[model samples]
Target: ARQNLKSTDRAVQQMLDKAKREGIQTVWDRYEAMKPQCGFGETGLCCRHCLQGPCRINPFGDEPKVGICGATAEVIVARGLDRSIAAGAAGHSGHAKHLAHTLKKAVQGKAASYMIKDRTKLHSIAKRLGIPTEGQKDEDIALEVAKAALADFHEKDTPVLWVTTVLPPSRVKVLSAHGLIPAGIDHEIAEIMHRTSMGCDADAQNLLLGGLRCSLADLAGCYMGTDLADILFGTPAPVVTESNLGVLKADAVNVAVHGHNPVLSDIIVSVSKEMENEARAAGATGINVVGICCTGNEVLMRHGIPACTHSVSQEMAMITGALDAMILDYQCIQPSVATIAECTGTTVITTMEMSKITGATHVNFAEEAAVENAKQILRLAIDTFKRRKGKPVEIPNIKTKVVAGFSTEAIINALSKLNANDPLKPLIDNVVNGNIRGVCLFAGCNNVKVPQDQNFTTIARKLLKQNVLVVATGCGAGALMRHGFMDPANVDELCGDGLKAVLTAIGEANGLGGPLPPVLHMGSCVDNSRAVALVAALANRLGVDLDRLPVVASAAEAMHEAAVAIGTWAVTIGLPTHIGVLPPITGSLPVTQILTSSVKDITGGYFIVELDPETAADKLLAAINERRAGLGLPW
Candidate 1:
């Protein structure tokens, strides 16, 4: 029976049911076919570092504890996890690098479509990076900032400034003392790949430390992605929108923007709106651009574009047969989407040169011709819509209204309304007075291994009911928004009275009639930096390092290597981090022990791995309470 299908949202369930009826394969079907999944890899006992061994360490109190190279389970496991961190770092840093180059192009006037949108953010970040903005135009300041950012990629005498500058001074000292500070984003990533290759770094604990250092490099990338993106595309602010596959319209040219970066997706959103008449000329009502995954999150945050679906349920959007095209930029775009497109006649357009699908229409998206490329893609979608006129389609007609776009600036702006003189004071006072029990950030994505959104929904319900001020990013935000967790009207019903009162006070202060949404949508995975900014602000206001704040991060149902990188940085930055899925390091008791407990002594942060959603919520709450106690706040 299709048990996993029932666990998702109603909008998603409809598509899953339809796909089953029509014999169309979804992630769930493929997951089922992968029965008795590889336990060796699951347990982190499998190592393929060298040709001499795709070594499978016997788990049963057994013979083969070491690889052919005499690498112990701890060494192999640490090496494996280290490489995962490197991959994750490469991914996030790559995204930031792309944004940096785009900003460089925009400032140099080489890229016609790209412009510096958030001048204030530009000056603010430039000043932070020590790029002199005094008496400088925004473009000149932007060029300096971009150059600094690009320069941070290579090995240097200095540590990555994004990592060094973003955290509190005390935490920086802690990282420095432990040798966890990354010299450069790419330098550390390359270091990890070299160290973990074979017979290079056999020390289990040292390898783990290296992973932590590279994860901070990943943090640098995540922060730069958020920073430069606000400079190019406007920063995300509060916006009202809808979610679920129901955002797809039968009467319009529906184009789903897939992937993570806003470089092209942002252009697509703007162009789709202006090019409305062309769609009508092609016998369509208008161009309706909805989002899928993180790119969906990017547009959803800034432009109030509806999120069609997310992560694991992405294929379900094409399954609706209402999608004219699914245009991708990069990251978390499963190959199955192209396969689903084949069944539905939906055009799967892959825009990034590095991210192309076999069946997808590859339209090279470069910043130099960004606007023109967007127009060409939109036109293709319009033509595709014309071809599908009067064709049978099934949109679920199930969507919940969502209030999203809670970036650090947006959040600070909201808080400033309560106390214009000192924004963090109001939030800190609430925490001290016990009006807000604690803060929890929900991050990461949905996994096909778990029922879509189940862990996210379960944990949020528990946290919100307990008065935890919850914020989310990536598909974590997507899941909560789709489930009515981001619906402001449900504030009273969904949140504890303390949280509700605080939210209402801020909402009314901001001149809104009601309350702020229970779960704040802080943007894509990269925008986890927003949460870090919020926490750093709080810690700074309190004259304490970030470890003293009553804040925790949970990546329930985390699947991607990027999640591992993000989680590691979360812990490195002194937040108790949780992941529902067990990482591959479990086979090595020493590695597991170090990550869960030993690292806490050195960093004041550690992992809380619990598979059960309810128990995980309880653990996260306990961590917050512990931090609260450390700060002399009453429980």
Candidate 2:
């Protein structure tokens, strides 16, 4: 499980040397030390949900009371999980809410900073959601679209349309039959949170189901499962990228945006570019804006922006003292950031109107005035350029190359154009007949505590050799490219004969290298937003709607809580989103069951927590085969 590169690059080496010489303990060391605390068994055991008591339960082993409420292990887990999800959804909804608000303006053609980037995507969503768009004026269409999106969370009268669209036709039928499909986004989240609150849904399993429903609040309703992002931001395709500490620059006016929403992040990016021009005019260097955490992945994949690293790297970015300003928009905007900013030159600017920091500056982002904000932020960066320590800066020269935009449209086109001479039935036959197995999407952010970028890449390669077609994003994509899985020609060499044959046939037609045949390098974290989309598209291509299709599984190795919420939403929408490294759910039982199994009843998918990479791979492959088995495929 070694990364392809032999050693750290000059810049990375420089930072290490600086730390060593200065007797400064690096953030990575601290992260490594926290690994023991990350154990599912230990972390899940404790919870401080309310003011009364901080609960801790010892389920598998032995131990004490659940909390001040005296809830059982299951109940404890359920409550903890519900609260975590509620919190996560609160943050996610905050993001969707921003988009929804801007969407209304875009529809009215009043927002100059934001436009409908992909009308095809918007129209597709409108048609699927049954929002009347035909012959409607832009403003009228926008109102209808915005109304539907805004209502997704709050409207609980119908099934989650975003989810049903990708499910097997039968799955959709089943969901409809059960009347489990969501009505609106806000309603789903609000109800889930309300039910999970203290006395509601005491049964872990019942709470678990509600947990899945909470996820639907994000999927069936939020912009995640739809083509809304594609309509707003072009569908992200495979694009070479980099993250980790190596992407941070030294002399540049560095600004890092963290969190899940791109509304503010995108505005920041737009502003940064505008500011870059301003800097040039002022005899200053260009602005070097990068992303941190999930929002970074969102923009990086879609726009080919640079990502400094993931959640764990936030403090490290601050430690560098080189950052001009680090902007955030909800989720994982670490509470410790305020303290970290006091010492660094960085100013932590919060975007979501509700997520502002007590000490940080508030710059309300308006799509119509995005350019103006960009200029203002840039001027700040330029003026603060001297604040950047002239200390030697080191960045990882190593980066990855990828081709991202694999939206439902992109995938459908690829699958359609592929020589079906073998035919879809035969492909299914091969799997059922024991020629091929299932599929896996090994994704999530990279962590410094791991052996560089080896965790995801090594596992993905091993799975590929085992005939598991892997789709990757974020650091996982970077790891694969950093290795050799992304070389296109190598993919053929790694796969089984049947898989290679499939790739070779398609490779020749598409002018692609054999290795680049099946595995798709989807863009950054936000691009994970596309995975469920691809699943739905796959269902559509296979003549399935969403649920009845062969099983497909996703695993985030070093996962984040926000990502965990996303996985839940994905499951609620019908894709089993698993986690290898789950948060401390043992601290609460209700949350644990909900995170792992409760949602399965409603979404036809559930969260599976695994610790071992090999075990995680096994669970994922099994889930895929389980799906294929339904289609009469072998293996």
Candidate 3:
């Protein structure tokens, strides 16, 4: 019996029940229908990289042991892993390329709706890239910054500037010595594709190093994306918002923005308000725009737009029948969304040229025509609201208030209240005094294979009780926020005595009048760069590399190729990364050993694979303790 493929959230579970009764198929239904899955593919034994042979290596020493190309298990596994890293790198770097180009256009007065919102961040990045800012116009400085950022994508001889600028000097030297520093973002991605072809790069260790180089490209893309995004759309600061399908309105035209990029989403947010009158004219009260997935986090961080749903339960938002349109940009959008929208009479609009669905509306969104295009998108939703007349709008009454937008700048400013001259001192003091044991970044997507948000909630509560400071991004942030972990009220209830005290002190000092949320909601997945910036600052202050920071990253339910790339880079940057969903490298003993154990000796970071949430917490805590011991700090 498939034991009720439902969500951990009561609201979502209720919708799942409703969908089943209504015969509305969902991701869970699709997942169930994909049962008795291929063991060869699951174990990384199936290789279809070339036309010569669609190969399969036997995991057991029974049938075929090698491909027709004579590729060993380690070689196949390494190539498969490298391909995933390249795909992930392509997704992120592609996103960065889009943003960099938009900034370039915006500075050239081509993108009228887009303007530099954070000059401080823009100038800071300019300084880091060594672009001249003094006596230069803001537009001129922005153009230069954008050009430098674009150069990261195409430059072949030079290492990515952001990777070299942000990482510690010693860390760079080590990676450089190993030839792991990426030549360029797109160049590394192309190299991975080339190397993974049939007989290009067969050595497992060498392939893994190539994977590391590509993963660095992933990091560079993420960093550039975050920095340029903050400059274009105002840097996220502390903002109060709400989450869950309950944020949808029964009487209004609810437009849910899904996917990753902030470029179109930010404009849609601006245009949604402008189109509110049109919605009212269509016999609706107004336009109520909410977020879904990372795009949801993006808008929520900047504009306090409530989140409608996370990754796994995205279809459930439309299941409520309250959503008029779900606009998507790119990445992590299930192809089943258009079918789900068809069932619910919701208008599914794909804005990006690269991300159009077959049965959905595609309004080509160009930064050159951003505002006019966004207005057209909103008008479509407004028109759709008229069709939702008398349709059953069953919005679940389950929502929770969350304080989000804890950019590194916001965190430092908050901490400065405790130590006016040295903001990081308060956080450092807490760590040294054991008021905070360590920090853990909860990142990545929610897998439908796991009950929605179950792994994140379970692991978070356990770690918070052990005095670990938890920060979240992507669907992980969505999970924590929806469950009220981002509610300040939960701090005293859920946190350990030590962590509770730190939260209270920080909150009071920041004038919140109560403790901050037990888990801080950092922005979307790309904003994982914010978490990286925070740790890099700490490492520099402590005169150590990132590997010795007593910090860890966990992708408890990572479900996308981009997440695989992110985790690889986390290991490459010297942090013990935990993955709840087992990556498919266990078929090869050499590759698994290298990722799980031996790589720690070389890069100072490695993988910790544990599927069970509680066990994963234990393993991560042990890792924190080990790092603490290495730092000569009491654990």
Candidate 4:
């Protein structure tokens, strides 16, 4: 098997090359080991939502196409795709809802675990959600804001004004024409699931379009929250940090938490501090807590240290047999968490209601009772010590020193750093004349079901190597940082000559105090709004029409549909964005068209979804070069 891999076109090729070099067979040894088990391959027919004889419409070149429920192959596929969107939307929206609940309690001064980190964003979102924020106190404001934020679920014909208006006018027209313009955040999601109901709208194209509409809420929320987070927790800029399996420890009690809900993990991180005190009580030396997958990023984005691995590394990290306890929060919590722990003496614990282990220990995290719950779990995990067989741990010898914790505000400030001595008459000079020419945001979740971290890190490392100034948010950033890409030497090795020079200048400016220059570590998933705001500010400040700005491009390898939505927002706002994975929009050609070609008419940029990493890298490089060319600069 490949030693360490995430979703990278380069690294994937390297893995294949390495396999060839070592004469070792891999997971791809499919011919003899296993035959295909995909039942839907031939007809694209599959359904099980209801008990209406959940059947398949096996369609080939001339095969008849109609499942027992009378659904076509297209309907089957569209329904499947819509359900995926709903599942994803539910997962993400549920997370947002929890944040809302936390915000509500935080505002009432009742919760000590979480504070009002971004009340400005809170108040502003309240105003946008159509909540009366004028005379409201924090609690009242939070209630109104929470209701309004949740209202995105049931909106009707009206497109979310904030989201649609931000798009290029022509692109907006295209979305309107296709009925792809979602009414509200929650409304879009509801409508998709509602529309995709077994007997509901079954046109393959229409169902897929509903999936696209379901995505509008994600864009709307970010646009709403962009300035709020800036007002609240500051903004993100380039800092460095290391992540992944190597960050786990053997001697210490390893507690790994998966999922993306920071509201819970935020409490867990604090409770982990308390866990150390419990560790002292339990007679253990220390409590070593590492985050697996996106939850790690969610926690690290706010309360830095004991960083995370991207999505793919979660399972592999567990195989280390060092994890004494596992906690889950929200997204990417493996259903396999139950069986996976059976192999080791690891104590698996699930915290979220949706995530509470069926077979593993149930430790629902209550913000009000976090310390008690954390200490309890740690104590129980320590009890498992009698089961451990005293095997030696094999941890990886890879890690990077990254200075993570740059908000959008920090990036804007860093723009002025190049001309610290001479402030005036050279505002755009740093971005244009200096080594930093453009930006590439690496954002989105990881998928362990695939080679998650490998693709993510490979792409990020390659982008930095190309001199494309990179900013990272969420798990995508963590995956790359884990492999030492955030280190100055690795950065210098990967980046173009000009970018290397810029990194050198930035190092000198900061006196080499932290991670490399240019690559700012933005905060959690919600903080990705910071990247959007930074680009918007860069475009505005640089005096370039948003579409004509010198900056361009982004990539998310194992992207959530949220990435698709965010990528759409980036494209609409005039950044050429590319997603490493494609949503199954096989039916909605118009929806696909609007995201790709149509975006250029609106914002002078568009979205490109690529499966191949090297090609994806080339596309990103091309987009950046194209933006530079548009600015009359040499590549």
Candidate 5:
């Protein structure tokens, strides 16, 4: 009997069938075999900090009341949550630092391959952060901005300038009042790591607060990532692209850039045209570079690059046997893709010193030799395509049109078409008039525990039908893009009458034939900052704190630590945050209450853990309704 996969994509399901028949192990198979997993760890009750004992306290109260170090269940859960946030902050820190370093070199002329693409964005941000720009050269302004951005990691002065500047002033005041303000990005991450270690901070509430502070670091880093990325690689504007397995071609040397960073990936896209002759010489029609994960979202928004696949189904790109090369740089690459490469004869190339996999060939990316590195990777793909010549490929003929690239600037540009002066007034009027109910940002990745894209597509459909405007990032955007939610043509089909009218007005104003898509693509997970910026703009225009706004967030199928920290900050910033998967904090009543209720009163934000899509939609709608009522608007 053939085991069925839980994926919603037909092409990925077909690939799963092939993998099953060939005795190839996929993520789904591994997940199936790991059933009945340890409950102690799942509940955050398992403690392995010391060799004295890997003690686990029973929630049913049959075993000991605490761990070997007298750590209560609540403290244990808080520590786990705190550490997750630390790891997430570290991840974002690293991502932003990479961009910061690259930008510094670009301005210094050491990285000759790179140059400042978005001068307005650079000058605009530098001025906002109190950097002078009137008398200085653009390159000089950039160097100062890069220095200040990197200086944010240390606590030499200021309370994390990005956090203090980007967030609403009311939010900064509120966060500072509770002592939730982070001194420095690196300081908070290090403090959490040190605090959560053996015999350190043990108070449950204190631990959770530390985690929240670290998540603020993540927020700053997230903002930094987008800021630097847009300056180096031009800001994302409205772009049209396609997604799904159908983007793969049989005759081209199809290379999928599967990672979270755009350093090498962006270079690869720019240098690809020069290598077209080399690809054709090796029997390939040409070079086709598609993205797989957040890195894909980066280029897809910026360059109209098609997304081959994302998150849980990333390996399916290779199973088509049409992929000649899969060049990976960092996070979310899924090392299993290398295993799938063995079966499909796909050359798997890994860059970055810290992100090496066992069976993948190393190209070892260097910013100084960035252009050459990209060309060599494409040449490698061409050579692999030579071996794949005349071979039959099983590419699914199914794909959909995607209209993504909705940065805050792009959103404002579209709104400017509707209102020449004050763009936000139309949106505010719509919300108050009940034409638009609220705004929801769909973020995070797909998990094998649920059907791929099921949570994202389901929640988006429900929200759009209710006239709640939707924006998506990371794999969440990929999920909707693949399903036609990001297509402007699908507005009538997907959006409620109120939202449909608003979208059509904006689209027609911009000279588009139809409405904007129900789901606006807001770029990579790093671009969550764009969503925050949009919300902050709304808050400023309304003259209200963020708490009373009809805004919400959902990480429907979250699986990453960075996603976890993002949710933490979302909660801190006063949004009803919905997470599909139950985090480890469920093991303790105190911490759970603090997360879901106690903190709600203190911060005007709380966690909503609903696994059912329909119910989750209902809950989020109720939340928006509650905020609307608070704002004296209609339900």
Candidate 6:
């Protein structure tokens, strides 16, 4: 019965037990009631694209082999997968568009709360986009940059400029030669929907190509999202923080900022201080603001706010009963939170016009009036805190220390301590000499099918034991941070001798006198591009393409459409990407074969689907060794 809890976190398990005792239902309780799930949808065998056909294809040879429109197994599977890629594209592109719009407003002096914080990153991006930055005001350059980013969503003929700028020249030629380069982000997403419609794009291979193109657009959006965010919020550097539900306080008015985009949360972090006295007047110790999901990561990276919880465990955080309010922006926020907040005394405040829950308080968040809106939100939380007097509040005691904000610049700065004249040289030397066998990047969300944080921590520990350097972003970072992997002491306990020695030397060089953490936390999901940037730097230093660098990405237990797009682009950018949860395309052998094997020949990377963490580690290490052999490095 304890196994049914299916979580490795002691705090989560305790909450589950408490939730049962209190008659408060949680996600796991609902997930269990959904047992014996639909096989057709699970296998990507069902398609309801049009009203004429809620179609189901037979995976076995004994039943109906075609849809009403005569779409075969491979075609149906590819179309469904393409649709998922399109949804993923929209998520990231929409996020990019929001930030770009804010930048545009900030440049026009319309958004009073928003201003350019990192002029260097702004100029760098402008130069890359071929905008004239010399002798122009920062606002003028910012306006052009924002326009260029928005243009990716509308331009009908030309390829997305942001994507072309980041992709290698050789890979650009490869994608162009194969006609895979997307004309525009919105265009490609619309194309996927149009092509997958009834009586259109019947060929499996053609549909798969469309999926790849849309996935490229997803990459473009994510890259732009990170680039513009760095310009506005300033790129992240090393910062100390705490993680876990225990970060909440019993005496303080605990408010959790949940969701993806930092625009809203960043403002909330700034405005919380203004409302501290109000919180104290309500008889609370103070106003305590923590993070959840990527928004949590956003403030944590910049302002050292503690990360309270992530996707699956979010409701569990509210179960602590210390939460005054859970302020949400958009993305990865479960609808069940409205119900959970009702059971507890916590208020669920939905800030985005497009992302309101039925039971949640609707407070529209606008960039122009961001500061005022934030104050209103905090005031609501303060008022809500006064009502918690007679409520049963239980704050968990399970917080861990974390070292976060390892952006590309921060990592290079740290490595520069070892070799001031040649920062990349030290890392390269370690890889060449095998002190670091290879690099593994971990990202993506938790799934209900697998134990939350179990797959991520298992695979990470396995790779660390094998001397592989591990870096993480998104909820994967949350998992590692919550599990004590980000604690510096774990470097000596978990890492191989060679890795431990290298980490110790680098730490001592940086004057820490102790080794760095086993796992490096590299910010949010959108910040995956930071890992891409770091690898690109390495590839340039070694005079080789990214594929030869012995680097791989794993989205073990991946759950969101955004993660689908992320893994797709990781492979497109020439990294072997692994997913622990099986995607819906497994019903079609042709679709599965293309993703897992044949695509490697065309793009030097492919999908690896393994559920077992130990076996996945073996496969990743073997792939790294193969790349080492290809690079003529010692294996």
Candidate 3: 10-residue stretch with minimal lDDT = 1-10
Clashes of each: 0, 68, 0, 36, 0, 0
Task: Name the 10 consecutive residues with the lowest summed lDDT in model 1.
Answer: 1-10
| Span of 10 residues, lowest total lDDT, candidate 5 | 1-10
lDDT of 1 by residue, 262-364 (tens): 7899999888889999889999899999999998998999899999998888888888888999998888999988888878979999987788989789999
How many steric clashes does model 5 contain?
0
Clash pairs, model 1 backbone = none
Score residue 171 of candidate 2 by CA lDDT.
65
TM value for model 3? 0.99
Better model by lDDT: candidate 4 vs candidate 5: 5
| TM-scores for candidates 1 onward, in order | 0.99, 0.83, 0.99, 0.80, 0.99, 0.98
Model 3 stretches astray by more than 4 angstroms: 1-5
Q: Residue 487 error for model 5, in Å?
A: 1.0
Q: Please give the CA lDDT of all the candidate structures.
A: 0.90, 0.61, 0.90, 0.61, 0.90, 0.88
**lDDT score, residue 378, model 3?**
82
Residue pairs with colliding backbones in model 3 are: none
**Stretches > 4 Å off in candidate 4:** 1-60, 65-80, 117-144, 151-181, 198-209, 221-241, 385-391, 416-431, 445-454, 504-507, 510-518, 542-556, 559-575, 581-607, 630-634
Please write out the lDDT profile of model 4 over residues 1-635, one tens digit for every residue.
44334334232334345434544443343322655545553223567766875575443445445666677666777677666655555555666666656655666766665565666656665664566867667767766665555554456555575455544454566567666676776766677777877788877656655766665566566544433333233333444445655666666677776766655555666666766755656555667767666567655555555663555445556555667787776656656657767765678887777666578888867867766777787776666543453776556554556667667545445545666544322435545674665678887766433465556666666777766778777776676666565556665567777777766765666567533543667766656666666665555455555677655545455546555555554664566777776555433455456557764764466778776777787888788777778788777
